[PDB]
Point group: C3
Chain length 102, copies 3
């Protein structure tokens, strides 16, 4: 049972309608085939933005990310990562972004 | 080959721009790891709303749900569930929602 | 390690706000259970449209498709296919579409 990948949401520096999701700790996993990895998104007030408008998930690499809003409250997010290659994520690396269409 | 999870779409009571997806029958599945489960969405006229505007999928628990519109017609929907924990879904339970951005 | 499914984006004939994704080569794969298949989307200028507005992924069959925008540049797209049944994709067949909400 692989450990969860931890990210923290931050407002993008350039575009206020983009949330950056940063890797909290190094995560390296040399895997084989397309795997599913649970991503743990820390609750933060910035997340509320995702509950106000449509959005598009942006991948920062060779993998796909599935995001879902949560029924309860506006400060959480569910996310699963589908890796294509081997997992070599550095701390502080950007995993993904969500672009909000206002 | 696991049996499909069956849901029925209903208009949310509070927000007319939200479709609730209710579990038709009890589904319990004590699984290990992230699994993919096909969700069977019954055709219903209410689904048409998903073909008129953008939308966001809301998860009602510890799992992620992937929805796709279907090429043919406005009364269907494709959905796959990615469970994070063991599956303990009660009949009449809400699996997920789709929030439509008008 | 299954080979990637190759698609090419084209503007839909009827609706200029729809991108069609056509199968480049025949891909048949009699599989068992829900599998994940990496889809290889050729870079094309038409893709830029996905980076300008919200969109909805439309599935052309019995499978689900996960799309993600890419951090770098407006001419690429990430996509993973989750097959429900056995894979019998013909060359020139439409795999999926993306409907852009302007």
């Amino acid at each position: 049972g692989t450990p969860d990948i931890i990210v923290n949401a931050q407002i993008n520096s350039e575009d206020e309608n983009v949330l950056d999701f940063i890797i909290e700790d190094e995560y390296y996993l040399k895997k084989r085939g397309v795997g599913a990895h649970i991503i743990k998104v820390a609750s933060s007030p910035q997340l509320r933005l995702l509950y106000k408008n449509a959005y598009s998930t942006v991948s920062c690499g060779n993998y796909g990310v599935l995001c879902n809003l949560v029924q309860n409250g506006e400060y959480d997010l569910n996310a699963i990562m589908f890796n294509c290659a081997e997992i070599k994520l550095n701390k502080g690396q950007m995993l993904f972004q969500t672009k909000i269409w206002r």
